[PDB]
Amino acid sequence: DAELLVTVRGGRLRGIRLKTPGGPVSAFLGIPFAEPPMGPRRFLPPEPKQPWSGVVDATTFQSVCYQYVDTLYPGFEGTEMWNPNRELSEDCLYLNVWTPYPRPTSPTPVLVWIYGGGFYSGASSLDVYDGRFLVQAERTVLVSMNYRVGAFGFLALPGSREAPGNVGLLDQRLALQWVQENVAAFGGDPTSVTLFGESAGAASVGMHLLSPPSRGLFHRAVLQSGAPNGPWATVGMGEARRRATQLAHLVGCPNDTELVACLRTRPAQVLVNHEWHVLSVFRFSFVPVVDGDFLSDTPEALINAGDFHGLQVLVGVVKDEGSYFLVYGAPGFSKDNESLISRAEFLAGVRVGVPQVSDLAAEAVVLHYTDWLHPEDPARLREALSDVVGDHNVVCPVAQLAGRLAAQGARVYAYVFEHRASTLSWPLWMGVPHGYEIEFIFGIPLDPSRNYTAEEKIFAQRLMRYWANFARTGDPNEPRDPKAPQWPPYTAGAQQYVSLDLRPLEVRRGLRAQACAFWNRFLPKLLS
Amino acid sequence: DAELLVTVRGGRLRGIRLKTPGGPVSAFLGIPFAEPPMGPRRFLPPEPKQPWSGVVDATTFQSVCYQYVDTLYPGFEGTEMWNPNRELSEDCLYLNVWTPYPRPTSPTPVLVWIYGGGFYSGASSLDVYDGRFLVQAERTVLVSMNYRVGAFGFLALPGSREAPGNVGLLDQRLALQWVQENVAAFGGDPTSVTLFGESAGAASVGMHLLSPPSRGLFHRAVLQSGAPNGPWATVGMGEARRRATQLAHLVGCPNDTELVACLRTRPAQVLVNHEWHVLSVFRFSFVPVVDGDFLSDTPEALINAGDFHGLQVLVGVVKDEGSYFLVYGAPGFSKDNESLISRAEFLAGVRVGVPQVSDLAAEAVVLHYTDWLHPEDPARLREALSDVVGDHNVVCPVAQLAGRLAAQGARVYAYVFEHRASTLSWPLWMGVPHGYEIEFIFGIPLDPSRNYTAEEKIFAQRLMRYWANFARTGDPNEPRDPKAPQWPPYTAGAQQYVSLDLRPLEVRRGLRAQACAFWNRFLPKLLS
């Protein structure tokens, strides 16, 4: 009750006590770290939040940033758990800070979450990102921000002062400068800050490694199912311009000053309602551009040039990365049936999964992913197209990144997440889809109101420990403790990684190595 | 002793009685079936042998046709067993006929052997082609011919009357017309004639299937380690011309009439001595051309168009097709050491194994054959390059052929030969190289003067039975007899085949299917 008042550079705050079967936690939800980016500020870099008199209420999540809402399947958990759970508003630059009770008395290490969502969706307030269980169980400090998405975050007319692009990334940065200035007040150690994110959050964390001005602001990194070198995670100057112009057109706008002037007068919902027709699966309209500025060169270029001495990184993927994307465009697919596609369907699906490449490139994808004893087996065709989408978008970019980092000075650990939640509502055939590790890392199966199993509970705890050990010491392994089977670093040569699963750790070699060689070494030669 | 005189259309012959641990056999070795192709006949189609008075001696093998002699390794069995074992001469169009003792009293089925040797070498007289053991053990009639090789067989200046090409193939044909006219005299059934050959003999048998004038002359076919659709088995009109002209140049010759006139005056040995500098491994200078005549279109074209209803075929390969070719040009290789090559060596070797393709094509070969967990393992690199040479030259053309035949009316059986002879002198690392099944089919391990093991002897017998059952009935399987594990036809869909081995038959699916898809479906798109 004493522990719920805290003063930070901007002024005073009041928090709320949250429960956990193991005991309570103090949360400060809804803290403003920037001026609302409204009116003439729509599309500009964020500016720091002005100080305030009085006590700001931080007992409740603030507004979700404006975003498209998935509505394919009203009532469906699988889909609705990703959708906004507070009112939409352009006024959304708030962050949240969980801290243990009692407050810690030395500086303690800080985990900062960056939500995924394809850069077009997501909120720090989703049930599945609740920081209470992780902070309780491992006495770390946890911070999450909201950051602008879609046009409001990533519309770009390259080299104009009025919509420069990458402002969502700047939002994230501002929250990270904020953590530097204020986490001490919550008992948090600003000299031990570990970023972690999924999907576009992982791409985001990636981009922070490669942006000199953000490297100052953290010490370690965790990329779950995502990387900044994705074919979906960034976009070229011309393409960004073309996408911006088309959005403008579609809302009746009409020279850059005039374009962004006109855009600035449209209701936020009007923009959102046209985001999707500017573009396939696993492609999103407004993603980070390569401007020369937040990124001085392509993510690929910067990874290759970079020095990563004295940096620890945890990276990983789920069993079935590509699966859930398929019911968003691939012919023959539906979540409500087994999706046993035919071969014709498989070939047409490959052009959807791997959009605009030479037919020569498509053929080569088809050879590589067909089993020639069973070229027409519907179930095998389903799994394969799944892999195509998975490998191309997530597993291969991650493996490239992982390898290049280890080879260049970084200590790197790697996983594959292989447990299907007992509570999942997507169909059996999708396996362990994109995003379905997150709830285990966040400790959600401890919430008694939810229906997880006993082993599920234990597993979640191991997961929180790995993550927290990584955060504290740059190594997931149980600080000083064999047997507890060991987790070896991933190197370019031995390419070692572990399976996270109800079973004890197993070590394995090569993150889909044969297929990655195809995407990473062969295929380029042949777009070219 | 009565059984050693026989009259045939051309006149009378005397044969010789040969021994076999199981009992004797009658051979007629050295029968002329064509006029000597000497002088002005050098390079022309063969003409039929004129009749003779008196009794021709057929108790001994005739002359080997002119050919390059391998001399890399004097004294070496591995090499010398393929070299000529009678005097070389242009006078070489003789054939041989083994028949059981006592002579059979109904028409019995005839096996005709066509030796391999890259179309540049080979003789019906090699120890390893001795027909005695097979005729004794399965009471079939066996016939082998000599046919012209190298320039004398396959020099071609397309569409001239003076060196039309394909005369070696015509030689073979003439022996097959001969069998039609005379095998009856040895107790042989001219309405049941099964061709069988290895390497270029297999390619040869292949070309007979696709030549309307030869289809009349046999009923079944067996292609061991070879096919006519090989990238080495045929050559284009222009390339043949270029190769002929260069040979001419190299022996100081000098218009086609004038060129072949001048060539006709050179000593046969002079031609042989320059065969090799007109051209890599698994490529030979004088091979069948696609002239429009003996073959009306490419082997590939004719296979695709063809109707194979009512035709039985046995096809197969050895475990390690590519291995022995490597010490003929691939850097890092030697038979006298483990040939543990480096990666640089492996990449340079790929250009030797797969000569004149785009670098883009080479890369793709390298991706496909590298293991990316072990990209630098010398032993794996050895095996892989072996496979490259194997798959490209033998396994993939055979599989294409096999599949296209089954799909188009033919009954087809398929094997992989997986026993290393206990007596082999090539190094361990080469496995079961090209040609090393032949001695088991011919029953050689029964010869007591040779040092084979007991199980080896039994195995040879099973092999002779399979071959002989195929010859008699179009089906290798033990006419009426389960258990004796069954051998299923090979179809385009299930692609089933068996392992010939000391162990009982095992059934398997797919003749290197993943790799064949690369050679057969992908790679073409990308030379193009």
Side-chain angles (χ1 to χ4, degrees), chain A residues 360 363-364 367 370-374 495 509-510 514 517-518 521-522 525, chain B residues 360 363-364 367 370-374 495 509-510 514 517-518 521-522 525:
Chain A
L360 185 53
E363 290 295 316
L367 148 91
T370 292
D371 176 342
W372 302 93
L373 291 162
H374 299 113
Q495 303 168 76
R509 301 220 27 235
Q514 292 314 113
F518 171 82
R521 299 153 156 297
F522 184 59
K525 289 155 154 110
Chain B
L360 185 53
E363 290 295 316
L367 148 91
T370 292
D371 176 342
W372 302 93
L373 291 162
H374 299 113
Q495 303 168 76
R509 301 220 27 235
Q514 292 314 113
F518 171 82
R521 299 153 156 297
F522 184 59
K525 289 155 154 110

Side-chain angles (χ1 to χ4, degrees), chain B residues 403-425:
Chain B
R404 273 306 203 125
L405 294 163
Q408 275 152 235
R411 178 176 221 59
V412 179
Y413 306 74
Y415 63 89
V416 158
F417 183 98
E418 294 187 301
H419 182 66
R420 192 172 151 94
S422 63
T423 47
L424 234 173
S425 49

Side-chain angles (χ1 to χ4, degrees), chain A residues 339-476:
Chain A
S339 281
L340 298 162
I341 50 165
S342 73
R343 176 99 197 161
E345 270 171 344
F346 172 90
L347 311 169
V350 178
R351 318 307 300 265
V352 180
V354 195
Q356 65 222 218
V357 299
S358 57
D359 316 40
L360 185 53
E363 290 295 316
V365 175
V366 176
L367 148 91
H368 201 98
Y369 281 85
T370 292
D371 176 342
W372 302 93
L373 291 162
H374 299 113
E376 322 275 320
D377 195 26
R380 275 185 251 240
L381 294 165
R382 198 189 45 209
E383 276 55 287
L385 182 61
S386 176
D387 298 338
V388 169
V389 177
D391 292 342
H392 170 51
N393 284 303
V394 177
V395 181
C396 307
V398 155
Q400 207 188 92
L401 176 68
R404 273 306 203 125
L405 294 163
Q408 275 152 235
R411 178 175 221 59
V412 179
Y413 306 74
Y415 63 89
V416 158
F417 183 98
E418 294 187 301
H419 182 66
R420 192 172 151 94
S422 63
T423 47
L424 234 173
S425 49
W426 293 100
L428 204 20
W429 69 258
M430 284 183 192
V432 172
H434 204 55
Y436 289 88
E437 87 274 21
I438 308 186
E439 59 223 56
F440 287 94
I441 312 293
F442 276 90
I444 308 297
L446 304 172
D447 181 347
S449 85
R450 290 170 179 282
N451 273 134
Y452 284 91
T453 70
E455 315 82 90
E456 266 172 339
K457 277 153 177 162
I458 288 141
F459 178 44
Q461 276 152 21
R462 293 171 39 209
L463 295 179
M464 291 192 284
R465 197 163 291 272
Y466 298 130
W467 260 241
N469 290 339
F470 181 82
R472 280 165 222 123
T473 75
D475 168 356

